[PDB]
Amino acid sequence: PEIDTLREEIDRLDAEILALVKRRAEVSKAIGKARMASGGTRLVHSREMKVIERYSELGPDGKDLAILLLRLGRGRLGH
Amino acid sequence: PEIDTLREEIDRLDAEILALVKRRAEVSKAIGKARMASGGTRLVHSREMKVIERYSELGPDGKDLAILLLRLGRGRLGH
Amino acid sequence: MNWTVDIPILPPLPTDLRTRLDAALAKPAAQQPTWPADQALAMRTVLESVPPVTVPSEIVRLQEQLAQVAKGEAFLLQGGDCAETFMDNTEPHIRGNVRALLQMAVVLTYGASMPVVKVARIAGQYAKPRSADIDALGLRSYRGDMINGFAPDAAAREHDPSRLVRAYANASAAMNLVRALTSSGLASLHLVHDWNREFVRTSPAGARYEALATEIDRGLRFMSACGVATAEIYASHEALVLDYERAMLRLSDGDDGEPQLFDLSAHTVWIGERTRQIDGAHIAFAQVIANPVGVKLGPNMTPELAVEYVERLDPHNKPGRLTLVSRMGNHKVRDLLPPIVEKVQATGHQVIWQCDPMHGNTHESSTGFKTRHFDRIVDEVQGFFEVHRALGTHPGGIHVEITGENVTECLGGAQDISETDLAGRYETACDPRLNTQQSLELAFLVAEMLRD
Amino acid sequence: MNWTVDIPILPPLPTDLRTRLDAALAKPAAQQPTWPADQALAMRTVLESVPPVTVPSEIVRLQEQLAQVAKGEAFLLQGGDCAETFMDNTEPHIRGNVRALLQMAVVLTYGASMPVVKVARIAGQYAKPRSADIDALGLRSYRGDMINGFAPDAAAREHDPSRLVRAYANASAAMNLVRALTSSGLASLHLVHDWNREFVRTSPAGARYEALATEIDRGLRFMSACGVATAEIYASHEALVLDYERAMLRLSDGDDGEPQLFDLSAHTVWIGERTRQIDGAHIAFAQVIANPVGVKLGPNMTPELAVEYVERLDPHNKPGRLTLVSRMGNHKVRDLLPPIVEKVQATGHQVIWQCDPMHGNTHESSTGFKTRHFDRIVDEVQGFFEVHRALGTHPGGIHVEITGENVTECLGGAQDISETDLAGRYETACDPRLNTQQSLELAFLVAEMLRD
Numbered sequence A, B: 001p002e003i004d005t006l007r008e009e010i011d012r013l014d015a016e017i018l019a020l021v022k023r024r025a026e027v028s029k030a031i032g033k034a035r036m037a038s039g040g041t042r043l044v045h046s047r048e049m050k051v052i053e054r055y056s057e058l059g060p061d062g063k064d065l066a067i068l069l070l071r072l073g074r075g076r077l078g079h
Numbered sequence C, D: 001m002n003w004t005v006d007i008p009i010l011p012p013l014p015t016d017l018r019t020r021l022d023a024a025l026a027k028p029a030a031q032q033p034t035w036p037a038d039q040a041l042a043m044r045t046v047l048e049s050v051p052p053v054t055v056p057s058e059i060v061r062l063q064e065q066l067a068q069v070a071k072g073e074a075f076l077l078q079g080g081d082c083a084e085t086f087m088d089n090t091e092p093h094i095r096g097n098v099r100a101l102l103q104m105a106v107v108l109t110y111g112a113s114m115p116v117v118k119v120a121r122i123a124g125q126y127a128k129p130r131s132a133d134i135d136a137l138g139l140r141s142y143r144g145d146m147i148n149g150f151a152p153d154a155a156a157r158e159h160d161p162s163r164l165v166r167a168y169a170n171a172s173a174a175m176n177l178v179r180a181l182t183s184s185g186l187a188s189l190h191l192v193h194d195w196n197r198e199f200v201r202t203s204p205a206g207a208r209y210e211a212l213a214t215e216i217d218r219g220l221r222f223m224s225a226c227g228v229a230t231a232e233i234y235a236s237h238e239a240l241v242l243d244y245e246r247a248m249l250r251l252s253d254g255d256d257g258e259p260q261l262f263d264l265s266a267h268t269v270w271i272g273e274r275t276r277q278i279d280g281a282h283i284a285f286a287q288v289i290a291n292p293v294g295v296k297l298g299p300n301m302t303p304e305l306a307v308e309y310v311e312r313l314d315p316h317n318k319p320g321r322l323t324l325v326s327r328m329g330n331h332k333v334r335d336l337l338p339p340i341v342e343k344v345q346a347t348g349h350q351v352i353w354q355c356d357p358m359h360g361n362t363h364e365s366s367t368g369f370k371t372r373h374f375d376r377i378v379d380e381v382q383g384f385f386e387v388h389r390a391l392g393t394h395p396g397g398i399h400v401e402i403t404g405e406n407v408t409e410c411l412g413g414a415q416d417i418s419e420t421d422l423a424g425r426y427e428t429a430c431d432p433r434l435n436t437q438q439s440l441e442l443a444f445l446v447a448e449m450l451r452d
């Protein structure tokens, strides 16, 4: 018993995280058609480098969480 | 121009997401030594199933974001 | 309704093998079957002329592959039914157990990034030990079809020596089929993994395993793209019934060109927890035979006893000749296993450290059926990996009990098999096997443990 | 300081090949070198007896592998220096360009989950077209060392026909080495990918690519674990200089057993944007030779012209005989490419759709140097993939300009090469090549595009 205390702080942090990430997707999508509205490139390389750097604190799994957000925003390359 | 408006809403959502995920890690770690303090298993299978279900809304990348959180919490299997 | 074999009316051992073997069988043997020594002797005379189930060249080959496991360069997957029944000795059952093993091997191979040696509990696993000699219904205990009948009658539970021949006949039939399956299209890695991508599609827990089943699919396609385009499944059973193993002994020039004794009822056999008397006939039988052998080590094992096994069963320091099969239960493995490893590793002998997360985690259910919880099995393999990683030693393999059937004998998993489900498909003749869905689930998870 | 070759003192073509060839060279040819027709004729007589750079059996083999690309079952990687210099025709330079191509091929192969055909811009890429015949410093234009000198003197920019022989001699020397490298340990996939895991460790952008370099490492180890344990690099250059290609023609029984004309200066050659006159001698030369050929298609290409190329260069519907190399720039590919594909695909001809994200994205820099932005190259390949995915057609390959040297000729990438850096290591003799770091970066990214 008593473990279900944090299994609600988990449940909170998750639908919260989910909500944030639910948004960040379209914010990238927004920058997406935006920059592309002016003959711009779908992706910006050094920027995704900056996003990857953001989550480095998390350790080695940082870059791979970053790359999920990036896929969620600007989609899968070549599709 | 004007694109840097959301490149600050992105920058916000990210260090915010980072902060949430920075916590959820130890909350799992807490449940970690907790359940294990009573001859309990390191992992709970149907629970990680529940976490995976949480982020399904995100589409196919949902499960793989979930599994990152799980690795961040209860670590890499066999290590 | 029965068939009939005639009793005959083989060359002499060199005197030393004669002596050591007779010496070894002279020692006490637990859990042996009670039946007339003259009827058993008739059986063994039949079995002393029959075509072998295996041949020496195959055991030498397995010894070499197991040496690579010992040395940290391959991984041992041992699996199959807990107890083979003459009833279920059928093509669909064999095919599904072969398929189940081959599927787990592809997953494990990709995870370990090194070869997997496949050994089946098959073609002889017709005998088990019993803690009590009288069972739940006041009846004489069922000991596996090599001995008596699963049927719950006073007449079925009588120890019938004719079941020695009936066990060989079933064994070499299942082996014939195993040989045929593993040299057919069933062995093809690309075919075998499509069965696994089916599992991911149809499973409730597909999401947990889809990324990895896809990584493997890309590894297999990568092979093809580079210009590549079969299988080896070895037979093993617990060497419990000395009458049987005696008859199946054959003499042949071995690893050193001098004549050795091979037990040709299988490729490898293991002495179990209730039969590893250090000065007993089981352990001493293991010292005369050339086969790779294993020993179950449960929670009452001492680093010093473990070492005595290593020094008796691996006298010549042949890496991979001896496997030490850990079964402590998850709550005990992390504490009990390390001291055993440290002391054994210190001798300079290269054993295979095989995990058995099944026989240390059984528990009677609230329905009357004996079951095991998926999450406890995972925890011990995990705990087993945690301990070897901490010490820098090799997690050398696993030893699981499985079927290719969708039975409901173990709890949890992707199907959240509950205690009220264990009655819907409890097929097993002894202990609760992981159904195919839980088999692959574990193989995926153990593959994750193997990664880094 | 110079060596000297004697001028000689080959069998006649069948009358039809005589006629079609003479007919084809009679037509107008853009961008040909001005030099005395009698000196050029002396050179071509030397070159008509020399050992070939390639042989027909190798071109037939490439035709077959390219047919698999055409049909959606393999992927074409074409790469190398923009312009080869007799100056840099050295082992370290060749080795690093071979290594660079082999590295990109492993990455691309895993991404495409199908075979990659490797074709190098090497062993003949000694000639380029020039938009203006007078360059930045009021000098006669440099046209590649097959013609004149990169040196910025009035005397160096004179068109010297002896550079025909000097070009063959360099070509077959570099080819000899390429053959030796690809049959040595350099070709081993496991060796080649360790170079890639080095790149991930030492690169600023390693994080972007580490997961995938590790997935590949596990695919390679998976191969080994299954019991596996070489390379083919084909030569290509732009067929610009008809005097040269003429001499290197040899006659041999071809795909149909009747005699055909193979251009043995290379395995495959492509006509470029400034030389694809539909009724010109370049395009008509391409109709007499058995080699796989390609045609550059820039932003002024019409679906109907593209079809006329397909009907002239692929008259017999030999899948993979014709490659159509798209170079539109990223902002134009998504709009211009689809109509061309739809109309060409409709003819029933199976062309290879090769992307060229380089020659449509050049732009003079604010330093005086001509450069290209990494992010624009990516966008066009990406855009190229987006268009083929939308239509259900095959993204058949790429065509990049690269070196195995850490030059600074293209902007961006992992090194954020800026406009003030393009002067530190601008080695190229013509257009800005992606250094090795940007080569692999693109190969990783194009591999991501290939996945699903």
Ligand SMILES: O=C(O)[C@@H]1C[C@]2(C(=O)O)C=C[C@@H](O)[C@@H](C2)O1
Pocket (backbone or CB within 6 Å): A027, A028, A031, A032, A042, A043, A044, A045, A047, A048, A051, A069, A070, A073, A074, B007, B010
């Ligand atoms: O330019 C951008 O900043 C936006 C946001 C984005 C992200 O998802 O963070 C980051 C980099 C770009 O490739 C895409 C995706 O557009």
Ligand SMILES: O=C(O)[C@@H]1C[C@]2(C(=O)O)C=C[C@@H](O)[C@@H](C2)O1
Pocket (backbone or CB within 6 Å): A007, A010, B027, B028, B031, B032, B042, B043, B044, B045, B047, B048, B051, B069, B070, B073, B074
């Ligand atoms: O029991 C639990 O709920 C906690 C949290 C956890 C998570 O990270 O979400 C989920 C499942 C468990 O395997 C681990 C990790 O412990």
Ligand SMILES: N[C@@H](Cc1ccc(O)cc1)C(=O)O
Pocket (backbone or CB within 6 Å): C010, C011, C012, C013, C048, C246, C247, C248, C249, C250, C251
């Ligand atoms: N089968 C014999 C032993 C034996 C084995 C092989 C032989 O070639 C000879 C004897 C026994 O049980 O005692």
Ligand SMILES: N[C@@H](Cc1ccc(O)cc1)C(=O)O
Pocket (backbone or CB within 6 Å): D010, D011, D012, D013, D048, D246, D247, D248, D249, D250, D251
């Ligand atoms: N080299 C000759 C053509 C040729 C090629 C091969 C031959 O066998 C004969 C003639 C030319 O340039 O016109």
Ligand SMILES: N[C@@H](Cc1ccccc1)C(=O)O
Pocket (backbone or CB within 6 Å): C086, C087, C089, C166, C169, C170, C173
């Ligand atoms: N399994 C059946 C059929 C069988 C007979 C003989 C050999 C193999 C199988 C039996 O035990 O009799």
Ligand SMILES: N[C@@H](Cc1ccccc1)C(=O)O
Pocket (backbone or CB within 6 Å): D086, D087, D089, D166, D169, D170, D173
């Ligand atoms: N590259 C030098 C050296 C060389 C000579 C002859 C053949 C190959 C290379 C040259 O052009 O002269």
Ligand SMILES: [Cl-]
Pocket (backbone or CB within 6 Å): C055, C056, C057, C058
């Ligand atoms: Cl033999």
Ligand SMILES: [Cl-]
Pocket (backbone or CB within 6 Å): D055, D056, D057, D058
């Ligand atoms: Cl030939």
Ligand SMILES: [Mn+2]
Pocket (backbone or CB within 6 Å): C082, C083, C401, C430, C431
């Ligand atoms: Mn059992």
Ligand SMILES: [Mn+2]
Pocket (backbone or CB within 6 Å): D082, D083, D401, D430, D431
């Ligand atoms: Mn160029």
